[PDB]
Symmetry: D2
Subunit: 484 residues, 4 copies
């Protein structure tokens, strides 16, 4: 019928076009109300109760703001109402594929449960989106508002997941090269500067109790479309380059303080463990009454629709003896009897730990031979080793090298700015790894032992000296001259 | 040692290790799965907050106030023991909340167990006792200098009131300690201060009451042979504003017409599921949603999860309950028709609520209608709005002191403050909704409703002339 | 010339059309950087350092937001870019007439210095605006952007001061654009963008939280026909929010704008200005010299009249300015006139402006019947009378608001108080009376308290809140108390 | 005298001890109400109307919060009420020496007006403090609250300016940590920064990412090389790096905004041209100039942002030139920014050379056709030192930490134990060039000289170099 207004604490009163309202009011979308944005983060930051639902609204809203701003300043781009709606829909829908506790599901659980599969929430989102459209008769409604479902559905999916085919050249079918800038708004594959980040910076900061340093409204006011290598791309004003570096700094701060908090991560790990032990016994009904498992619900969207943070409580409140082991792990979370953090270290020089080796790392720590008297001996299964990749979104690459700028005196001429033209106080590297070790045996003597193994292992591998190394393992740290 | 927790409202809060022990139990952690505002989240998408974080905030603020009083007035002899008991009461006053908070004890239990008299306060005391006993907390209390017999009694009394000086947990010289967590005299307590700031932060509305200011100006003075908390005289304006803010929040958010109808629909689903959902309590015995309040072990497991258990069920027995919840997901909600109030001296009684849909359906609007509606097509929601004390002004039950005589308590009347304040402190709103959502039904529903208002002499609905132009002229009182 | 972006802490990044930039970059406008929004309030709330300049930008911005919103939702209104600019200009320029310390100047100083004259900041704003336009060659620039100076200047002035009888009293725009006159300074009911900026700005600086959401209001606003005018109508649902908006305004007055100490500091500054008024010279047009009290007669002199006068007096060495300087120095040492107490007239009693001068005499004429060391005279008392209302004297402004319903968006309606709530005020205006004493020693203050409470008893005013404590021998004689 | 409560938008309701109230209610302190925190920043960020007065209150408050926190957690430090009050007084009083438009005065005006003198706001503050105490009979009042004026006044001054082997006389080595609260000379981590981060962010419309309340909760005193120092929890090292990053951001975006700086420069110019004619009465009726008022505190007391308006509203023909410059600010006819570059070479341009830089730019010989020829006096060259507060040094190397398992044992954490994503350098210089000739042809020319000069000196390629000077940038192969 007409627009709805929604009050969001981050963006204020947001207007939603009636087509967007139709998409929102479906089981597939409403599911996001039962998925925590930050997963296990809520168990450390009690303000982080927010869910993927409200984040999706914000992304949809901001995507609209940017495409409206570009059209208003540059009418010659011929941005249509159709374009605007398609960008908003992609914005709303890019989080549809998230599973229970968000990054826990595709970052920890699926890789362990279905190692062979290559699953990302992005692929999930496209499949969920297709299911949403077809199950709810949205195509007719799209037609009613001037959309062309064949080309526009393709455009929406491409915004979320990138080109759906091998092109080998313009690889996209939803829109031509003169509308290339539209693909940079929701999920920016070139440099990661998109409206998804801008919403979560402000939303997560508001809920976590941390203040956000990046100003997205400012960026929107200064954004322009310019020709770059025969594409029309979004360009930023030159003098905003400092702010872009700060945006990635902020992202990295948020990961350090919150998203990769050592305890938040161990809770995610414990929940994943419970899910693995429950995976043979939980049944989720999908299409035609068929039953799926937590690990196979990703193969049927009807089942996946019903896969939310509810699984946690279904296990916790179960009485089935088959779920006893899964239930016991979750109960340990309630009593705060967590696996204990031992410490953190990093590889030095060039060392980079591969995913294929993650499984062997607890074995290595347990194989260390600290020269200290120990009452207890620990085994591989008593250790957890978490490897964390921290970067500016593009592996070792500087994403600001993939941004186009313009100057005040020549607004149509795109230019490049190098790091050395900005500041000497910027990072010289853009990627790193952290290694955390935890112990499943929580008593005083086990933990003392775990610390000696860990510090010995760091010494043997030539990793960095843990910050508290001299205090937790005063007999071990002297043997390493590099640390003294 | 102490844990530090980062709360978005209060910042970094320090928690004494005994509080940490109480928090890290199934009975307390349960509050992570209970939305503060129930169905409000379905209208204000920022309101994702749960009872858990609110409880921390209350416990913190209760500590702030008692610490402040002890610091300024050492002669009160506030002990570390007192402080901890007030913080524990603060942490634990929300323990008795059920699924979707006020939906559960405000709508569901009254309909499901009309004979019973249940409040979340009573729930909290029972849950607290169960928490203590199930988790071996008494020894730990002893270890930090608490005396469980007296102090458990003190804590419960802070939450629910007395189970002469009617209290056993502390004597009259510590009377002021009973005003911090749940203030039975006038409702000015740290529970409100936390939810004002927390709800505002999540709802996207700005809070006008400054509790830090209040804490700086609070003193204990003798009032009728009790030591009570007294506010500085100048602060009386801020107190009126505190209640105004509360009433605003209810108007805009807690009693939002759609939030309420969603709570109503969820309640309906729970009623239809109540025969079939089984909750295991003590000794393996099975309970229903409506009887889980009789066993704390079962109640521990009763959270917002029930909603999703019903929604995702495949059992044909749960078909009807599941259908209602699915209507919520598609946003096929019962439609709001309008709102009115009783005029003059009319007050609608709880005993009459059930007859009201019948009355609306019996109205005979003189207009041509395609469809005829029945009682079962109408929902009538009666909402009591007040300043927390029925028709009473709660500021009449506050004690103040002046700068020139800080130990002398005084009273301030409404007329000494402002003529721009309310003359009444309680009122009723009547909302009507229609279960039939099509265009013709809605048209008809509007004519019935306005006719009914006219017949009953209720206030003219705001949009009355637009929704029912043939009906409103017949009433001269309305023009 | 292109658009400038400006970062405001309240509104974020605001875009300004180049014509607005031209108006801003003049002595007449830049003057507002040197005038405190809240006058003496800064001496009580140290966060309130903000000036009229930034407030004006905000008003100009919000006026643009609203007129843009209306044009986007209802293209049939035929709002032109010309209309938008004229509304923004009126928004920017409605504060131009403010004098030193804002409301101190026209609320206290001018009435005392020039009792014969009838001056308001609104009239000041129109005169300043005219002077700004003419002194800076703005008329040609206006023509360059499609404005028609004859009509549009008239329109801008009318937005600020109202019509310069009749169904339609305005000349700048016709009745089909009536809704444009409701944006910047709403004479019908006071619901305008000026309030929305200062609620959010003052709250941000004072450390108080604002409960009115103007962005919400903009989203729900529509233009409808009302009595053959096109007016702005609010959605029916929003009527509660409008009552709250006036409650918030009254809260802010109670807590901040009429703070008892902020007011006494304004009074002291006014006193210093009065004592300096013979000696301070301000050069206006053609080199003529003016006084602080006559600078309002020449805009060139008025342009140079800012909070700077305060410091010019404070730092003076001239013996002629000794008395003015001593008062201000008492402010620095915080040796202020002492607050005695506050009371109200009962029920429906109102004091009027003509009587204000006789009030110190009355207090001094009270005969307490308590033993006193010192006797006080009329000149030792200050009596401040404060009118608190919902912006329209005894009237309910919500009675002058038009609403619309969801089911009939083009049909305007009225909503009465009884259709909203029984918990609303039954009265919309009241007076406070504050008494202060210029003699600050312990014995004088004790005496002042007895006179004051006796006077309250004699006049049948309300019992001061601390009456029993400050005057325990006086309050028993009144059984009603 | 009892405690006063004051409502600050940043900190909320702050309680002030009556002795602090007595210090605040003096001409010497109240003067800070008339001095903008950010100077010419207000002319770019209209929210930045805040003055030094409210910042001083915030610093005094936070200094009290921290010393109270330390005493409460570690009674064995023997912090007295006397210690607390002295730290709060230093906190309140460290801004007393600021002149008109804050950093404009001692960063630009005094160096140009009195090149021979060595003046800082810190020295100003100690002299103002002494004058405040003596003019207002504060010593007796101090005694009344348990202070010992001889030792405590010395302590307060030392906290502000440093020492006038253990070099301090106000307190012994076991109270070393008290000298780290208000102006931390060891590493710059102090409560002054925390207040201005939050205050400036609130007014500028930028959000602050350092949490000082968190830091206070985790701070401890530990023994380090026979001194008792403040130590941070090991975990918090990341937050400290972020604190300095925030400081640098704020300088980049706001404190050193290219236009805010040019406005300060123009105001400085006007002050220079007014300095012979403005008279400020000091002690015994002696007259001082703006540039000599720093020699007499009675005169300096009266030296505030008011000078700006006294000049602007003057009618004296002698002040005509000063008045014209300020009027150009009102009409926004500013000196025009030409561009920004940095040295590539490791030697910092020295303060002694600043004067010769306009001459160098004017001596560049761009190979381009130019209508107009520019002279040295048409160029302004502003050299800006950006660092982490300690020249080339990493201030986190001068921070002590402690671990959860051994809270009294201080440790060091090196940059490599924290992250590879941190800066490799901690100091740099920016060079901004502006032109006093604002017409289109002069500005075109200025751009060619500037880029040519960058090329000749081997400075970095200006960001817009290829657009402003397309004929000049190709000649430098390094720039591609
Ligand atoms: N008074 C208020 N102040 C702030 N937010 C509000 C207020 N009232 C409602 N909201 C929020 C809740 C929603 O997120 C959003 C829309 O609510 P509302 O405008 O009441 O829509 P609605 O759909 O209930 O009304 P209708 O369909 O009658 O327009 O604004
Ligand atoms: N850098 C940060 N900024 C703001 N809040 C943070 C930061 N790091 C953690 N928090 C939040 C999460 C928690 O709510 C609270 C306590 O976290 P933290 O200090 O990490 O406790 P911890 O228990 O993990 O550390 P430990 O047990 O080692 O002392 O602060
Ligand atoms: N990095 C920033 N972050 C937030 N606000 C900023 C930043 N830089 C400047 N501001 C503020 C200050 C001003 O109020 C407003 C305009 O500043 P800026 O965009 O620098 O314009 P400018 O006129 O100085 O540059 P130009 O004229 O080159 O476009 O934004
Ligand atoms: N109602 C309020 N809410 C928030 N801040 C306020 C309020 N009233 C005053 N303030 C601010 C202004 C000052 O910064 C600070 C103290 O003001 P106030 O309490 O009025 O003290 P006062 O000195 O005027 O009263 P007194 O001496 O009578 O105790 O609080
Ligand atoms: Mg609706
Ligand atoms: Mg911990
Ligand atoms: Mg006072």
């Amino acid at each position: 019928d007409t627009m709805k207004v929604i009050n969001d604490p981050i963006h204020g009163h947001i207007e939603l076009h009636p087509l967007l309202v139709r998409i929102i009011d479906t089981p597939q979308f409403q599911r996001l109300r039962y998925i925590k944005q930050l997963g296990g983060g809520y168990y450390v930051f009690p303000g982080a109760s927010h869910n993927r639902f409200e984040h999706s609204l914000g992304v949809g809203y901001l995507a609209g703001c940017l495409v409206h701003a570009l059209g208003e300043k540059q009418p010659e781009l011929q941005i249509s109402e159709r374009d605007v709606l398609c960008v908003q829909i992609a914005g709303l829908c890019r989080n549809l594929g998230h599973g229970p506790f968000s990054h826990m599901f595709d970052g920890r659980f699926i890789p362990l449960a279905r190692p062979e599969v290559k699953w990302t929430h992005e692929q999930g989102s496209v499949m969920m989106f297709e299911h949403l459209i077809n199950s709810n008769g949205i195509k007719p409604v799209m037609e009613q508002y001037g959309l062309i479902p064949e080309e526009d559905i393709c455009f929406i999916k491409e915004q979320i997941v990138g080109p759906l085919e091998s092109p080998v050249l313009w690889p996209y079918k939803g829109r031509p090269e003169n509308k290339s800038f539209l693909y940079e708004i929701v999920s920016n594959k070139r440099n990661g500067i998109d409206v998804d980040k801008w919403d979560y910076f402000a939303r997560d900061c508001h809920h976590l109790g941390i203040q956000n340093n990046f100003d997205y409204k400012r960026f929107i006011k200064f954004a322009r479309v310019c020709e770059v290598d025969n594409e029309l791309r979004i360009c930023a004003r030159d003098k905003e380059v400092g702010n872009l570096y700060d945006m990635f700094h902020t992202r990295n701060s948020l990961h350090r303080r919150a998203y990769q908090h050592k305890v938040g991560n161990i809770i995610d790990t414990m929940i994943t463990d419970a899910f693995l032990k429950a995976d043979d016994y939980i049944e989720i009904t999908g299409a035609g009454g068929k039953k799926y498992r937590i690990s196979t619900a990703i193969d049927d969207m009807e089942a996946y629709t019903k896969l939310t943070d509810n699984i946690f409580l279904e296990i916790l409140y179960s009485t089935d003896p088959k779920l006893k082991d899964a239930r016991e792990i979750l109960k340990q979370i309630e009593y705060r009897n967590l696996f204990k953090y031992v410490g953190e270290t990093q590889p030095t020089g060039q060392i980079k730990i591969k995913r294929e080796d993650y499984e062997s790392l607890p074995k290595e720590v347990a194989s260390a031979k600290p020269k200290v008297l120990l009452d207890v001996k620990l085994k591989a299964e008593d250790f957890i080793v978490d490897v964390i990749n921290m970067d500016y979104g593009m592996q070792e690459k500087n994403p600001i090298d993939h941004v186009s700028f313009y100057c005040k005196t020549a607004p149509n001429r795109a230019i490049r700015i190098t790091k050395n033209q900005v500041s000497q106080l910027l990072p010289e590297k853009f990627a790193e790894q952290l290694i955390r070790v935890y112990c499943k045996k929580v008593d005083r003597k086990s933990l003392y032992a775990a610390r000696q193994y860990f510090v010995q292992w760091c010494a043997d591998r030539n990793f960095t000296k843990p910050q508290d190394g001299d205090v937790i393992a005063p007999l071990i740290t002297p043997q390493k001259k590099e640390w003294n």
